[PDB]
Amino acid sequence: KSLILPPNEFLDHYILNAEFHRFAGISKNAYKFWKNVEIGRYQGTRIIFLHRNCILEKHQQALRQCSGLNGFVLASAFCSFTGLAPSHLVEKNNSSIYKLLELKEICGIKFVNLKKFYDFLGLNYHQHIYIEKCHFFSPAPFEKRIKITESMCVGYY
């Protein structure tokens, strides 16, 4: 009913409230007064997502014009989850990581396609990945983790 979304969980079943209430013509907080309401958020932020099932029939039209979010997560959550520095997701900074990632904005909210990144890494969607400069900690004799950039590595636990 009011869930915290784990940061590695895709927003398939959700729409962004900031966008939906504009299409619907309703108030930003109208969802607080529906009776059966399922919402989600990521721990670090208060951006509200509505579960598609709880949308009213009075509003199914506005639902259908909402952006899809299959495989996506909030970009801030992606950086929280992976430990990647949020600067990398700013195009201006010319990050090699930025270029490996499918990004997207809705109402000025930035999303990352975590599902495609997992596929690129060849990992299963339930693994906790981290992204790190290979230089930072490599005790082993050579680097044994997935290396995706001149300087960046990926590990998991």
Neighbours of 66 (CB within 10 A): 20
Beta bridge mates, 49: 16, 40
Contacts of residue 51, defined as CB under 8 A and 6 or more positions apart, other chains included, come to: 13, 14, 38, 39, 40
Tokens describing residue 119: 């596929």
**Residue owning tokens 């059966």:** 36
Beta bridge mates, 153: 132, 147
Technique behind the model: X-ray
Q: What is the resolution of this structure in A?
A: 2.6
Question: Hey, where are the domains in the chain?
Answer: 1-70, 71-157
